[PDB]
Amino acid sequence: GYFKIYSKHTPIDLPQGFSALEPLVDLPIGINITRFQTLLAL
Amino acid sequence: FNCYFPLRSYSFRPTYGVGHQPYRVVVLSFELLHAPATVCGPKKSTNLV
Numbered sequence: 051g052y053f054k055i056y057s058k059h060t061p062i063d064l065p066q067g068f069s070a071l072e073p074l075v076d077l078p079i080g081i082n083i084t085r086f087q088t089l090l091a092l
Numbered sequence: 093f094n095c096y097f098p099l100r101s102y103s104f105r106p107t108y109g110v111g112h113q114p115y116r117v118v119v120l121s122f123e124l125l126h127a128p129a130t131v132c133g134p135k136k137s138t139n140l141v
């Protein structure tokens with residue numbers, strides 16, 4: 051019943067190295083989920 | 093012929109008696125579902141030692 055988003059921002063294919071991701075938001079939504087899509091800024 | 097408007101106005105006046113004067117009514121209904129139940133109620137606190 052919770053939707054969790056973790057994130058990390060970095061300066062620089064995907065490179066080498068290690069970096070952990072910190073929690074950003076927990077949302078009390080509780081909706082069934084099956085599929086997703088992205089957006090662009092044309 | 094046996095046909096009238098179902099809605100008629102209040103027509104309130106100050107002279108009306110206690111039983112006829114307007115009264116505002118608010119109904120609060122609580123619904124608990126399969127959700128994390130956001131609205132809970134205030135929690136107190138005390139000074140720390």
Ligand SMILES: *[C@@H]1O[C@H](CO)[C@@H](O)[C@H](O)[C@H]1NC(C)=O
Nearest residue numbers: 051080081082083084085126
């Ligand atoms: C998501 O899951 C719930 C509970 O298992 C179910 O009632 C619902 O139908 C599901 N969503 C879809 C689109 O089938």
